[PDB]
């Protein structure tokens, strides 16, 4: 319902048991590092007027040059609409190029 | 024998089962004089009615505690050296024990101190579903006696110079005794192979009369995880798997849930016929049981049409895939369909009649 | 959508609508009806979820009711159901308006007509006597003689009766006899070897009076002028009559101790069929029959359910034989639908909880052949026996959050896959897990809603 | 029979001056349970009990409580209802008296506790288990617990055991345990809507056991030991 701000990253790989998010800017990461720890929750977008609630289960950071990659792995728990109804169960699947936000 | 007549739930077993072991023997002998004496397992005649009577009579005896007069206390004080003379005709209540000099007596831990089984025995006898064990009768009307033994076997065997098929309809039998039944039947059929294959094997030649046993829905009575109560059948059948080939009695198993069957029985099987299996654990169990088939040919099972089978074993030159034709006549079961009957309307139930039949007597 | 329902059920002859396989309502799961109801089915969920709506929906479809209307208003079809209810939640589901003309046989503490003399020895012994006292060795014997002889005095007709045989007798006559034997007194003087009375008269045997009436006699004395002896147990089992008379006074169980008809008299030996008429539904021609037992105390539930089950099973057995001589299978199919089974089917083989178990166990083994089938539902699957669950062909389990429960629900049935096992806790409302033989190919489904919807420290020790 | 430490079992005598007759029974239970109303928190001190009979004492107390609940909740269960007076049994340092591998000496402690595990909800007696070495504690008792609270764990074995037990906890969320700060915890099971990481504040009053400090006290001089009086009280009798 409330404004969720500016997104951290986009989806790269999707599946009913795993979701991978990528960040390519260290300035943002350090900005929100506190809320990106294992055990915390993220909101992802599947469609218009719908969001999914996923739990982090891994973080990796790498610097390869030939620059920064940050990978975050998640596991979905349920769904939340714009009105604010939290329904457990995750049948839907998010398509790549969709955004991720930190849960206020 | 222990399972049918004694239920180990009670904790009075320590003395009770021992008392039953003792009780049986004396009568077991006292009935058969020609065959002099016997033991606990010996299958020769006896009577449960009068075992119940004695173990009930041991509840009302009054023997004398006098000094120099060790005789029982009756109404007319008839002297009996042994029990046989007077327990049979009618249970003999004796003069109540007391400390009086004239009628002093002894009372012990058998004056009805295990009655609670006395309660259940009469009921097991009253059960009219299970008449066929505890009150078998001939066609003439008289009860069975040792000489009749032949019949109890013939029904299964039949005749040497012809072919027969016997079909036990275990559906009607109650559920607590089915394992005992199967155990006994298997023992008999095996012992009629031992005896008859005494001589004709002169140089290792199979007999003229071979018997094939068929075990449908095995997991009901040959469980992998089952309590002692269901263990009898586990033993008797296993024996055939071990040492039946010598004597001429074989075995066939038919299961629709192999995982829950005993491991040794399938282990001692030489040919295997597999139809479609659509669950995973059974798939792995089979994939292990027989190692001739590479892991790759095992993925054939989940995709086999109706009446398509895989045969693997010593009989054929090479493992193969085949197709049955339909059987004529077909096997059918007279099952009852529920929603086909609900569609029909109400049906008047002549309650009075059903209840009259229920009455008994 | 069109093709899948056909692929589902045209091979079948009698199909059953069972919901919506996906989100779209057009996708109607059509399970094979007979295999579903011809064998035992288990629905065992968790608290905080709509298992009751699903059960009611299944049953409503089974009977024809839908959308607050009875499709079979003019005629009554042949469906026979019997539901055990403990939370008192199922009466309304079927109680629709009169215009549709549906006769529902509600039943409960207030109007039951279930006597005591139907019961077998095993229950009865627990009903009156309690083993905890530990004075049984002789009192039970005298008890048994009393209950064995009482039947004799009331009736002359039957022959070769026993303790278990159900015939008409009184508990009051028994307590009278117990009192007067506790107070029995025998005259010790010469030629007085029989009960000596207050009027100094002697009687041939106790039967003439003691069952009939209470009596007072002379007191014992050492002196020969006053010598007499008391009952052997005089002042031994007064506690027995005390606990018993206190037990009876309870109001909650007044039906059991004395069931009076509508006219007012108590039932008799010949007045038998009526009782069977009640639980089945042929008395008022009502298909469904509910039994609300909430009023009953937590100790006697097993006794009640066992007696009911014995009746329901024997009925179909005897009908099946009466028709086998006719050469046909039974036409009256009955289905028992347990609710809150754990209360009377515990895992821990408690003594009282044994009485019911075997009875219900019987129906699981031998039922299909005779006409009676069973459907289990409990909120806590952990505290329920395994033997029952093991037999049921088809499983439908709802949201199951707990761990101790879901490990059980998994361990009972290995047909459950590894990938789909993780789905049982995470479910949306209405979603169920179906597995077994009835589905032409397995599925996962959810339902819509049903309309109608289902609604002193020192004192304790004295018992110990 | 002479040992003075062990005379709460053998030689109990009334507070007035009299001995304990069979009728006095009620009183003993009164001290554990208390008044039905007006919540009570009884505390057993097992520090000064001899190490020979501890497991007997625990078994005895446990059975007493369980039976009281049986008898109280027997009839009030009118329809699927729990008792108004629920008990809670808190077992600290469980591995001391409920070992995974032990000889008959500690068997008496299992049999009772396991009872409460298998069949307690019906009567209102519930448990709480606390251990700093979850590996050594009995296996059956853990799997019968619905909810779990876990704080920092550093030993590999207990990490793996706890990681096995909790089903919803995956391989990923378990790597979190060795990284928890002071007063931070991970909660799982039915009570919470979703698994979560949280944090406690300090309690008031704090529990500080009267431990004996050696090297805080080893730097003082010889405290003269009035040996005479020590032995004088040690004559006794």
PDB file of N, CA, C and O in Angstrom, chain D residues 147-195:
ATOM      1  N   UNK D 147       7.326 -25.724  18.559  1.00  0.00           N
ATOM      2  CA  UNK D 147       8.056 -24.506  18.273  1.00  0.00           C
ATOM      3  C   UNK D 147       9.500 -24.625  18.727  1.00  0.00           C
ATOM      4  O   UNK D 147       9.847 -25.452  19.569  1.00  0.00           O
ATOM      5  N   UNK D 148      10.342 -23.787  18.141  1.00  0.00           N
ATOM      6  CA  UNK D 148      11.762 -23.772  18.434  1.00  0.00           C
ATOM      7  C   UNK D 148      12.277 -22.349  18.482  1.00  0.00           C
ATOM      8  O   UNK D 148      11.944 -21.518  17.632  1.00  0.00           O
ATOM      9  N   UNK D 149      13.102 -22.100  19.486  1.00  0.00           N
ATOM     10  CA  UNK D 149      13.877 -20.885  19.641  1.00  0.00           C
ATOM     11  C   UNK D 149      15.335 -21.280  19.705  1.00  0.00           C
ATOM     12  O   UNK D 149      15.715 -22.120  20.526  1.00  0.00           O
ATOM     13  N   UNK D 150      16.150 -20.687  18.845  1.00  0.00           N
ATOM     14  CA  UNK D 150      17.559 -21.025  18.793  1.00  0.00           C
ATOM     15  C   UNK D 150      18.379 -19.752  18.822  1.00  0.00           C
ATOM     16  O   UNK D 150      18.115 -18.812  18.065  1.00  0.00           O
ATOM     17  N   UNK D 151      19.346 -19.724  19.719  1.00  0.00           N
ATOM     18  CA  UNK D 151      20.340 -18.684  19.826  1.00  0.00           C
ATOM     19  C   UNK D 151      21.650 -19.183  19.227  1.00  0.00           C
ATOM     20  O   UNK D 151      21.704 -20.234  18.584  1.00  0.00           O
ATOM     21  N   UNK D 152      22.720 -18.427  19.433  1.00  0.00           N
ATOM     22  CA  UNK D 152      23.997 -18.743  18.816  1.00  0.00           C
ATOM     23  C   UNK D 152      24.452 -20.150  19.175  1.00  0.00           C
ATOM     24  O   UNK D 152      24.345 -20.589  20.322  1.00  0.00           O
ATOM     25  N   UNK D 153      24.966 -20.853  18.172  1.00  0.00           N
ATOM     26  CA  UNK D 153      25.496 -22.200  18.298  1.00  0.00           C
ATOM     27  C   UNK D 153      26.758 -22.292  17.467  1.00  0.00           C
ATOM     28  O   UNK D 153      26.742 -21.940  16.286  1.00  0.00           O
ATOM     29  N   UNK D 154      27.844 -22.768  18.069  1.00  0.00           N
ATOM     30  CA  UNK D 154      29.131 -22.773  17.401  1.00  0.00           C
ATOM     31  C   UNK D 154      29.691 -24.158  17.137  1.00  0.00           C
ATOM     32  O   UNK D 154      30.457 -24.320  16.188  1.00  0.00           O
ATOM     33  N   UNK D 155      29.336 -25.155  17.934  1.00  0.00           N
ATOM     34  CA  UNK D 155      29.845 -26.498  17.715  1.00  0.00           C
ATOM     35  C   UNK D 155      29.167 -27.124  16.503  1.00  0.00           C
ATOM     36  O   UNK D 155      27.953 -27.009  16.323  1.00  0.00           O
ATOM     37  N   UNK D 156      29.961 -27.798  15.671  1.00  0.00           N
ATOM     38  CA  UNK D 156      29.466 -28.281  14.389  1.00  0.00           C
ATOM     39  C   UNK D 156      28.343 -29.295  14.568  1.00  0.00           C
ATOM     40  O   UNK D 156      27.339 -29.266  13.841  1.00  0.00           O
ATOM     41  N   UNK D 157      28.481 -30.184  15.548  1.00  0.00           N
ATOM     42  CA  UNK D 157      27.557 -31.301  15.676  1.00  0.00           C
ATOM     43  C   UNK D 157      26.159 -30.787  15.962  1.00  0.00           C
ATOM     44  O   UNK D 157      25.183 -31.194  15.317  1.00  0.00           O
ATOM     45  N   UNK D 158      26.028 -29.932  16.971  1.00  0.00           N
ATOM     46  CA  UNK D 158      24.702 -29.467  17.329  1.00  0.00           C
ATOM     47  C   UNK D 158      24.109 -28.636  16.205  1.00  0.00           C
ATOM     48  O   UNK D 158      22.895 -28.678  15.975  1.00  0.00           O
ATOM     49  N   UNK D 159      24.946 -27.870  15.502  1.00  0.00           N
ATOM     50  CA  UNK D 159      24.494 -27.204  14.288  1.00  0.00           C
ATOM     51  C   UNK D 159      23.780 -28.181  13.375  1.00  0.00           C
ATOM     52  O   UNK D 159      22.634 -27.954  12.971  1.00  0.00           O
ATOM     53  N   UNK D 160      24.437 -29.298  13.059  1.00  0.00           N
ATOM     54  CA  UNK D 160      23.860 -30.231  12.100  1.00  0.00           C
ATOM     55  C   UNK D 160      22.603 -30.890  12.642  1.00  0.00           C
ATOM     56  O   UNK D 160      21.624 -31.072  11.908  1.00  0.00           O
ATOM     57  N   UNK D 161      22.599 -31.244  13.921  1.00  0.00           N
ATOM     58  CA  UNK D 161      21.415 -31.871  14.491  1.00  0.00           C
ATOM     59  C   UNK D 161      20.218 -30.934  14.405  1.00  0.00           C
ATOM     60  O   UNK D 161      19.160 -31.294  13.868  1.00  0.00           O
ATOM     61  N   UNK D 162      20.369 -29.720  14.929  1.00  0.00           N
ATOM     62  CA  UNK D 162      19.273 -28.767  14.910  1.00  0.00           C
ATOM     63  C   UNK D 162      18.858 -28.471  13.484  1.00  0.00           C
ATOM     64  O   UNK D 162      17.678 -28.225  13.208  1.00  0.00           O
ATOM     65  N   UNK D 163      19.809 -28.490  12.556  1.00  0.00           N
ATOM     66  CA  UNK D 163      19.475 -28.213  11.170  1.00  0.00           C
ATOM     67  C   UNK D 163      18.638 -29.331  10.585  1.00  0.00           C
ATOM     68  O   UNK D 163      17.777 -29.086   9.735  1.00  0.00           O
ATOM     69  N   UNK D 164      18.882 -30.561  11.026  1.00  0.00           N
ATOM     70  CA  UNK D 164      18.051 -31.673  10.591  1.00  0.00           C
ATOM     71  C   UNK D 164      16.646 -31.540  11.144  1.00  0.00           C
ATOM     72  O   UNK D 164      15.661 -31.675  10.413  1.00  0.00           O
ATOM     73  N   UNK D 165      16.533 -31.271  12.440  1.00  0.00           N
ATOM     74  CA  UNK D 165      15.228 -31.317  13.084  1.00  0.00           C
ATOM     75  C   UNK D 165      14.243 -30.385  12.393  1.00  0.00           C
ATOM     76  O   UNK D 165      13.223 -30.825  11.853  1.00  0.00           O
ATOM     77  N   UNK D 166      14.532 -29.092  12.400  1.00  0.00           N
ATOM     78  CA  UNK D 166      13.631 -28.094  11.850  1.00  0.00           C
ATOM     79  C   UNK D 166      13.413 -28.342  10.363  1.00  0.00           C
ATOM     80  O   UNK D 166      14.352 -28.202   9.571  1.00  0.00           O
ATOM     81  N   UNK D 167      12.195 -28.698   9.939  1.00  0.00           N
ATOM     82  CA  UNK D 167      11.998 -28.999   8.511  1.00  0.00           C
ATOM     83  C   UNK D 167      11.959 -27.763   7.631  1.00  0.00           C
ATOM     84  O   UNK D 167      12.597 -27.740   6.572  1.00  0.00           O
ATOM     85  N   UNK D 168      11.232 -26.726   8.052  1.00  0.00           N
ATOM     86  CA  UNK D 168      11.127 -25.515   7.245  1.00  0.00           C
ATOM     87  C   UNK D 168      12.485 -24.846   7.089  1.00  0.00           C
ATOM     88  O   UNK D 168      12.828 -24.363   6.004  1.00  0.00           O
ATOM     89  N   UNK D 169      13.269 -24.812   8.157  1.00  0.00           N
ATOM     90  CA  UNK D 169      14.647 -24.355   8.069  1.00  0.00           C
ATOM     91  C   UNK D 169      15.382 -25.123   6.984  1.00  0.00           C
ATOM     92  O   UNK D 169      15.492 -26.351   7.043  1.00  0.00           O
ATOM     93  N   UNK D 170      15.897 -24.399   5.999  1.00  0.00           N
ATOM     94  CA  UNK D 170      16.593 -25.007   4.880  1.00  0.00           C
ATOM     95  C   UNK D 170      18.092 -25.042   5.159  1.00  0.00           C
ATOM     96  O   UNK D 170      18.554 -24.739   6.261  1.00  0.00           O
ATOM     97  N   UNK D 171      18.867 -25.428   4.146  1.00  0.00           N
ATOM     98  CA  UNK D 171      20.319 -25.375   4.257  1.00  0.00           C
ATOM     99  C   UNK D 171      20.826 -23.944   4.337  1.00  0.00           C
ATOM    100  O   UNK D 171      21.892 -23.698   4.913  1.00  0.00           O
ATOM    101  N   UNK D 172      20.097 -22.997   3.757  1.00  0.00           N
ATOM    102  CA  UNK D 172      20.577 -21.633   3.704  1.00  0.00           C
ATOM    103  C   UNK D 172      20.432 -20.916   5.025  1.00  0.00           C
ATOM    104  O   UNK D 172      21.371 -20.275   5.496  1.00  0.00           O
ATOM    105  N   UNK D 173      19.255 -21.012   5.633  1.00  0.00           N
ATOM    106  CA  UNK D 173      18.977 -20.257   6.843  1.00  0.00           C
ATOM    107  C   UNK D 173      19.729 -20.789   8.055  1.00  0.00           C
ATOM    108  O   UNK D 173      19.775 -20.103   9.080  1.00  0.00           O
ATOM    109  N   UNK D 174      20.310 -21.984   7.967  1.00  0.00           N
ATOM    110  CA  UNK D 174      21.084 -22.509   9.074  1.00  0.00           C
ATOM    111  C   UNK D 174      22.474 -21.933   9.183  1.00  0.00           C
ATOM    112  O   UNK D 174      23.041 -21.884  10.278  1.00  0.00           O
ATOM    113  N   UNK D 175      23.046 -21.495   8.063  1.00  0.00           N
ATOM    114  CA  UNK D 175      24.335 -20.817   8.073  1.00  0.00           C
ATOM    115  C   UNK D 175      24.312 -19.533   8.889  1.00  0.00           C
ATOM    116  O   UNK D 175      25.358 -18.898   9.051  1.00  0.00           O
ATOM    117  N   UNK D 176      23.143 -19.134   9.383  1.00  0.00           N
ATOM    118  CA  UNK D 176      22.975 -17.912  10.148  1.00  0.00           C
ATOM    119  C   UNK D 176      23.356 -18.079  11.604  1.00  0.00           C
ATOM    120  O   UNK D 176      23.657 -17.085  12.274  1.00  0.00           O
ATOM    121  N   UNK D 177      23.349 -19.308  12.105  1.00  0.00           N
ATOM    122  CA  UNK D 177      23.412 -19.517  13.548  1.00  0.00           C
ATOM    123  C   UNK D 177      24.736 -19.050  14.128  1.00  0.00           C
ATOM    124  O   UNK D 177      24.727 -18.379  15.175  1.00  0.00           O
ATOM    125  N   UNK D 178      25.883 -19.352  13.536  1.00  0.00           N
ATOM    126  CA  UNK D 178      27.155 -18.982  14.163  1.00  0.00           C
ATOM    127  C   UNK D 178      27.452 -17.497  14.107  1.00  0.00           C
ATOM    128  O   UNK D 178      28.532 -17.062  14.509  1.00  0.00           O
ATOM    129  N   UNK D 179      26.503 -16.709  13.610  1.00  0.00           N
ATOM    130  CA  UNK D 179      26.706 -15.288  13.391  1.00  0.00           C
ATOM    131  C   UNK D 179      25.739 -14.431  14.188  1.00  0.00           C
ATOM    132  O   UNK D 179      25.599 -13.241  13.893  1.00  0.00           O
ATOM    133  N   UNK D 180      25.059 -14.998  15.175  1.00  0.00           N
ATOM    134  CA  UNK D 180      24.072 -14.255  15.930  1.00  0.00           C
ATOM    135  C   UNK D 180      24.760 -13.507  17.057  1.00  0.00           C
ATOM    136  O   UNK D 180      25.670 -14.029  17.705  1.00  0.00           O
ATOM    137  N   UNK D 181      24.315 -12.284  17.287  1.00  0.00           N
ATOM    138  CA  UNK D 181      24.869 -11.432  18.316  1.00  0.00           C
ATOM    139  C   UNK D 181      24.184 -11.675  19.649  1.00  0.00           C
ATOM    140  O   UNK D 181      23.317 -12.540  19.791  1.00  0.00           O
ATOM    141  N   UNK D 182      24.581 -10.898  20.646  1.00  0.00           N
ATOM    142  CA  UNK D 182      24.066 -11.102  21.988  1.00  0.00           C
ATOM    143  C   UNK D 182      22.588 -10.774  22.024  1.00  0.00           C
ATOM    144  O   UNK D 182      22.163  -9.703  21.583  1.00  0.00           O
ATOM    145  N   UNK D 183      21.810 -11.692  22.569  1.00  0.00           N
ATOM    146  CA  UNK D 183      20.384 -11.507  22.676  1.00  0.00           C
ATOM    147  C   UNK D 183      19.695 -11.396  21.338  1.00  0.00           C
ATOM    148  O   UNK D 183      18.879 -10.497  21.125  1.00  0.00           O
ATOM    149  N   UNK D 184      20.013 -12.305  20.429  1.00  0.00           N
ATOM    150  CA  UNK D 184      19.358 -12.375  19.139  1.00  0.00           C
ATOM    151  C   UNK D 184      18.988 -13.829  18.929  1.00  0.00           C
ATOM    152  O   UNK D 184      19.727 -14.727  19.333  1.00  0.00           O
ATOM    153  N   UNK D 185      17.844 -14.056  18.299  1.00  0.00           N
ATOM    154  CA  UNK D 185      17.295 -15.395  18.237  1.00  0.00           C
ATOM    155  C   UNK D 185      16.530 -15.637  16.955  1.00  0.00           C
ATOM    156  O   UNK D 185      16.088 -14.710  16.278  1.00  0.00           O
ATOM    157  N   UNK D 186      16.400 -16.916  16.630  1.00  0.00           N
ATOM    158  CA  UNK D 186      15.689 -17.394  15.461  1.00  0.00           C
ATOM    159  C   UNK D 186      14.534 -18.260  15.925  1.00  0.00           C
ATOM    160  O   UNK D 186      14.733 -19.177  16.730  1.00  0.00           O
ATOM    161  N   UNK D 187      13.331 -17.976  15.431  1.00  0.00           N
ATOM    162  CA  UNK D 187      12.126 -18.626  15.932  1.00  0.00           C
ATOM    163  C   UNK D 187      11.447 -19.320  14.770  1.00  0.00           C
ATOM    164  O   UNK D 187      11.320 -18.753  13.681  1.00  0.00           O
ATOM    165  N   UNK D 188      11.003 -20.547  15.012  1.00  0.00           N
ATOM    166  CA  UNK D 188      10.356 -21.344  13.984  1.00  0.00           C
ATOM    167  C   UNK D 188       9.227 -22.162  14.582  1.00  0.00           C
ATOM    168  O   UNK D 188       9.229 -22.500  15.769  1.00  0.00           O
ATOM    169  N   UNK D 189       8.259 -22.469  13.734  1.00  0.00           N
ATOM    170  CA  UNK D 189       7.192 -23.388  14.037  1.00  0.00           C
ATOM    171  C   UNK D 189       5.821 -22.837  13.733  1.00  0.00           C
ATOM    172  O   UNK D 189       5.644 -22.079  12.777  1.00  0.00           O
ATOM    173  N   UNK D 190       4.840 -23.214  14.539  1.00  0.00           N
ATOM    174  CA  UNK D 190       3.461 -22.860  14.263  1.00  0.00           C
ATOM    175  C   UNK D 190       3.062 -21.506  14.828  1.00  0.00           C
ATOM    176  O   UNK D 190       2.281 -20.782  14.207  1.00  0.00           O
ATOM    177  N   UNK D 191       3.573 -21.158  16.001  1.00  0.00           N
ATOM    178  CA  UNK D 191       3.190 -19.900  16.628  1.00  0.00           C
ATOM    179  C   UNK D 191       3.454 -18.687  15.760  1.00  0.00           C
ATOM    180  O   UNK D 191       2.598 -17.788  15.732  1.00  0.00           O
ATOM    181  N   UNK D 192       4.561 -18.588  15.037  1.00  0.00           N
ATOM    182  CA  UNK D 192       4.792 -17.395  14.235  1.00  0.00           C
ATOM    183  C   UNK D 192       4.240 -17.551  12.834  1.00  0.00           C
ATOM    184  O   UNK D 192       4.166 -18.643  12.269  1.00  0.00           O
ATOM    185  N   UNK D 193       3.847 -16.414  12.278  1.00  0.00           N
ATOM    186  CA  UNK D 193       3.273 -16.409  10.946  1.00  0.00           C
ATOM    187  C   UNK D 193       4.314 -16.758   9.904  1.00  0.00           C
ATOM    188  O   UNK D 193       4.052 -17.555   8.999  1.00  0.00           O
ATOM    189  N   UNK D 194       5.504 -16.193  10.028  1.00  0.00           N
ATOM    190  CA  UNK D 194       6.627 -16.520   9.178  1.00  0.00           C
ATOM    191  C   UNK D 194       7.883 -16.611  10.027  1.00  0.00           C
ATOM    192  O   UNK D 194       7.985 -15.941  11.062  1.00  0.00           O
ATOM    193  N   UNK D 195       8.846 -17.435   9.626  1.00  0.00           N
ATOM    194  CA  UNK D 195      10.090 -17.530  10.390  1.00  0.00           C
ATOM    195  C   UNK D 195      10.788 -16.186  10.472  1.00  0.00           C
ATOM    196  O   UNK D 195      10.785 -15.404   9.520  1.00  0.00           O
TER     197      UNK D 195
END
